[PDB]
Design a protein around this ligand. Structure first.
Ligand SMILES: CN[C@@H]1[C@@H](O)[C@@H](O[C@@H]2[C@@H](O)[C@H](O[C@H]3O[C@H]([C@@H](C)O)[C@@H](O)[C@H](O)[C@H]3N)[C@@H](N)C[C@H]2N)OC[C@]1(C)O
Lengths: 386, 108, 172, 63
RNA sequence: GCGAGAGACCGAUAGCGAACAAGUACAGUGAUGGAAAGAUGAAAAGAACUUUGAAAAGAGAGUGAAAAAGUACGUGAAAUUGUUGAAAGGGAAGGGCUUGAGAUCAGACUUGGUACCGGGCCAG
RNA sequence: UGCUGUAAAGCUGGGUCGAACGGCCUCUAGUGCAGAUCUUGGUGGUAGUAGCAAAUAUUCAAAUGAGAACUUUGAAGACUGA
RNA sequence: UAACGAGAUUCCCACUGUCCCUAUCUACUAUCUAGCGAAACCACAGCCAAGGGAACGGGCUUGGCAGAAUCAGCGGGGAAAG
């Protein structure tokens, strides 16, 4: 018989299976479509999620009730030191899809990226790329022949780049290595741009500007094994239910005589790969700027970090990206930032934001001061101050 | 290597007993001190003085002090076929405050 | 007594037995198979590390609904376990066989475990009490253990013959 | 090395509970030889066995 | 009941319930109910002694026609199980028919006859 | 290990074993099992699985011993609470 | 019909996680280990769709398909067990 009353399905059938992600680094499934007539540029950048804060802004949306009025908004800080380009990969079109033709590497690789090729670095002889380095030392002619191959045959060119994880407070010493696609120009221009950046640093401000709408790819917070009530949001059974109530009462009809894939079941929750789009860039701060957290209206000589540090992360001492709202992942998680895959002309996409104030009170409790100086001014001298 | 050596340590038992079942706090402090002595003396053969046991249990099953000042000495173990050439002896140190005390080598 | 397997050269071999041993047959079979065909000294070291929970015994047949461990990766398995009582009985038998070999003059460092097997011994019965005044079995499944240590025409047709004669006459 | 009988005999001879009997830890052999009540009395007199004091229950707060 | 002699009877799940310390052990308040359980060897000759082990035991040795008879003892099946060898194995296995491959088995140079006669098998 | 019979079955090689047994002509029967939720005995898979979670709570050292979470002694922390 | 009622019933005040709509915390389990170690049940077994068929198949016919060994859960099916 039919359901007595109608209700929408619990959970989405498009995020299946609800399993653990295959890798902790989130991969870019698709890159922005290439436009030959643009300047040669990177399409993505890797950073580390540091924490969240609060900002104040004036809204510019005519017709809104909050137009020309202050709004308070959550925002996320991504620690983004510059990346180092260490290689290049060429891809050829085939009737079976993109196939990588060859990979060319820079002459010198820093210890933090070479740690990525090891499970037991302290017990190894550190031989990675040691014979490859001699392909440059003689006359580099083999390297140039490989790059000529990429120019002749590739249709898609991506650069190999790694984070400088030792500029973050993370105790992990392995750097994160990723392929970032080069868009714009001819294939030959792409290879030349990759070559001139071998061993060089590329900064966030060259990929992402301020007011841009960008996407974040990351693995979500893990929760382990979870029951259906919280994993899928199903209704709790009545209090007097024998053998428990955090369940789905009927997991299927008699026929088909099999449990259907569409039925909510207990299993692993969180730690999923997600691609979230349309997060506005509120700031591209600079690590050398000693007033990262200051605005035009709030002139206090202040960094983006909250008093006491970001909880369970540390201090953000590099370039950073302040993003509107929340993004997938937890503190310390490597996040991949990607350019938008489409052109957006709506007000929210084209609005220019001007920050009034950024919060820097402690995230470790009910912080009521923005600065040590303000704390001292409010409380006066203390016993430990003599 | 100075095999025979005596040092005085502070153990932060408060963070080691965080969230522990209330009827296992003093028994777990015994296990935590044994683990602490192996981390510093490199010996799994750890012997606790009964005066240390009295100090651990002075305030009942969940009355362990936040910090304890310990004297740990590594000593030889003839006792042939013992698998351990050395052992650690742990004993309490009476001090007025267990605050602000660093690891110190004891000249016997 | 007759052993299930008799050594090829009894002069270079030494055996030991244990019968009616109150130790699990299934755990003992797995531990005996874990060292079958090993050098004696290597096996003794390995059993000592098993007792210390540094290495594990792979459970290959009697393993349904046991736990999973990373110490099984050594042997290509996920289900392994550390049965102390079986390990102790097998160690005592390996020690006895080594003593017998030494009495025969054999070299300990050459000895390999050339035979080891576990058999069911008769069960020991106890009783267990169930709901609604019922009685059930509560038996032991004991073991027989034994082990041995050991020092480590073409004829042709007429036509075939004629063919070969011709071919030999061709190449000289 | 099993002084259970000696503990019971001392409790009887001294006139207290077993909970108040102290057997010298360092005199295990001689206490082990004390099989009769007479030997227990001798050990009690020498101080090898001792009557522990009562646990105080003060009435000072009650007053 | 007492004393005898027998049988085309049964042969230890049979024959009386009981071939044995059987109306026993055990159950039930009680009336009553009521089993299982035979065989080392001619002879204990029931394994001295050495050695490993805390010991039970093992390994040598020893007795015996035999230990492939060691008081778990005549023979010692099946279910079920271990080890060894060989082989097979994409959501059962097993069967018939047919051939291949590998293993095993068999047959005419005959009960062969006296260099010859003559025979056996597979084929053109 | 083979041979014979359409078959019920019969015979034989090798191993184990230890005291009686078979062919033929007849006689006779408590004479042939896959089943009966059959009877008695024995044995599996399940499975090293369910499980060994009420009654506040144990710890240090010594002694003993081949071996000590579980024995004894000492120190202590607890409880029953007339 | 006063009083009485672990009797049946309706409304009101108070009260609340009964609910909107769930979240969080503790102990004991479960879990993993050492030791110990049952039982129910069991023709043979175990992936689907349709067909025909004792008219609702795990097996049969035609298709879809199909890769060792597995662990925690689960209650669709085994027209599950008793
Ligand atoms: C010491 N244990 C005793 C033991 O004497 C036992 O005896 C059997 C004995 O009866 C067997 O012997 C048997 O021999 C034949 C045949 C089947 O072997 C049987 O028909 C016969 O009933 C019986 N005597 C013998 N082979 C093994 C002993 N454990 O009898 C009972 C028991 C308690 O187990």
């Amino acid at each position: 018989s039919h359901r007595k009353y109608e209700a929408p399905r619990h959970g989405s059938l498009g995020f299946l299976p609800r399993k653990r992600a295959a890798k902790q680094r989130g991969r870019v499934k698709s890159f922005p479509k290439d436009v030959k007539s643009k300047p040669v540029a990177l399409t993505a950048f890797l950073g580390y999620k540091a924490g969240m804060t609060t900002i104040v802004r004036d809204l510019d949306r005519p017709g809104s009730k909050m137009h020309k009025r202050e709004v308070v908004e959550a925002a996320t800080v991504v620690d983004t030191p510059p990346m180092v380009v260490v290689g290049v990969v060429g891809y050829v079109e085939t009737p079976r899809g993109l196939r990588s033709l060859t990979t060319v590497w820079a002459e010198h690789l820093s210890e933090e990226v070479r740690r990525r090729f090891y499970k037991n670095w302290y017990k190894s002889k550190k031989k990675a790329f040691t014979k490859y380095s001699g392909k440059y030392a003689t006359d580099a002619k083999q390297v140039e022949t490989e790059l000529a191959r990429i120019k002749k045959y590739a249709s898609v060119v991506r650069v190999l780049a790694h984070t400088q994880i030792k500029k973050t407070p993370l105790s992990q010493k392995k750097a994160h290595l990723a392929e970032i696609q080069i868009n714009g120009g001819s294939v030959s221009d792409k290879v030349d741009w990759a070559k001139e950046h071998f061993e060089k640093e590329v900064s966030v401000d060259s990929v992402f500007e301020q007011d841009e709408m960008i996407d974040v790819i990351a693995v979500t917070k893990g929760h382990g094994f979870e029951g259906v009530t919280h994993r899928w949001g199903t209704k709790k059974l009545p209090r007097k239910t024998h053998r428990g109530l955090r369940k789905v009462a009927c997991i299927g009809a008699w026929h088909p005589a099999n449990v259907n894939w569409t039925v909510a079941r207990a299993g692993q929750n969180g730690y999923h790969h997600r691609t979230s789009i349309n997060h506005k860039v509120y700031r591209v701060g600079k690590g050398t700027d000693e007033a990262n957290g200051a605005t035009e209206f709030d002139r206090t000589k202040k960094t983006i970090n909250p008093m006491g540090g970001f909880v369970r992360y540390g201090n953000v001492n590099n370039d950073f990206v302040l993003l509107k709202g929340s993004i997938p992942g937890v503190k310390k998680r490597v996040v991949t930032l990607r350019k938008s895959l489409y052109v957006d002309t709506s007000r929210r996409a084209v609005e220019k934001v001007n920050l009034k104030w950024i919060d820097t009170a402690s995230r470790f409790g009910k912080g009521r001061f923005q600065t040590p100086a303000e704390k001292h001014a409010f409380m006066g001298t203390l016993k430990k101050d003599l | 290597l100075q095999d025979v050596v005596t040092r005085e340590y502070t153990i932060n038992l408060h963070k080691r007993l965080h969230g522990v079942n209330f009827k296992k706090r003093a028994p777990k402090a015994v296990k935590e001190i044994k683990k602490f002595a192996t981390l510093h003396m490199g010996t799994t053969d750890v012997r606790l003085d009964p005066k240390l046991n009295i100090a651990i249990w002075k305030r009942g099953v969940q009355g362990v002090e936040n910090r304890m000042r310990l004297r740990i000495s590594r000593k030889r173990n003839d006792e042939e076929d013992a698998k351990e050439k050395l052992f650690a002896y742990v004993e309490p140190v009476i001090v007025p405050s267990t605050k602000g005390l660093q690891t110190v080598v004891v000249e016997d | 007594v007759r052993y299930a397997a008799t050594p090829a050269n009894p002069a270079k071999s030494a055996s030991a037995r244990g019968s009616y041993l109150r130790v699990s047959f299934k755990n003992t079979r797995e531990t005996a198979q874990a060292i079958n065909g090993w050098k004696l000294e290597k096996a003794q070291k390995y059993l000592d590390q098993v007792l210390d929970h540094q290495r594990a015994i792979p459970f290959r047949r009697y393993n349904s609904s046991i736990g999973r461990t990373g110490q099984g990766k050594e042997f290509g398995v996920t289900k392994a376990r550390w049965p102390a009582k079986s390990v102790n009985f097998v160690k005592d038998l390996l020690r006895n066989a080594q003593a017998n070999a030494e009495a025969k003059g054999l070299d300990s460092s050459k000895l390999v475990i050339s035979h080891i097997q576990v058999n069911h011994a008769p069960k020991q019965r106890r009783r267990t009490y169930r709901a609604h005044g019922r009685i059930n079995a509560y038996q032991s499944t004991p073991s027989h253990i034994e082990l041995t240590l050991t020092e480590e025409q073409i004829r042709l047709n007429s036509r075939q013959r004629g063919r070969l004669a011709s071919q030999k006459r061709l190449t000289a | 090395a099993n002084l259970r009988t000696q503990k019971r005999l001392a409790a009887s001879v001294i006139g207290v509970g077993k909970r108040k009997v102290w057997l010298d830890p360092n005199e295990t052999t001689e206490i082990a030889n004390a099989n009769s009540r007479s030997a227990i009395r001798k050990l009690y007199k020498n101080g090898t066995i001792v009557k522990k004091p009562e646990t105080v229950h003060s009435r000072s707060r009650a007053r």
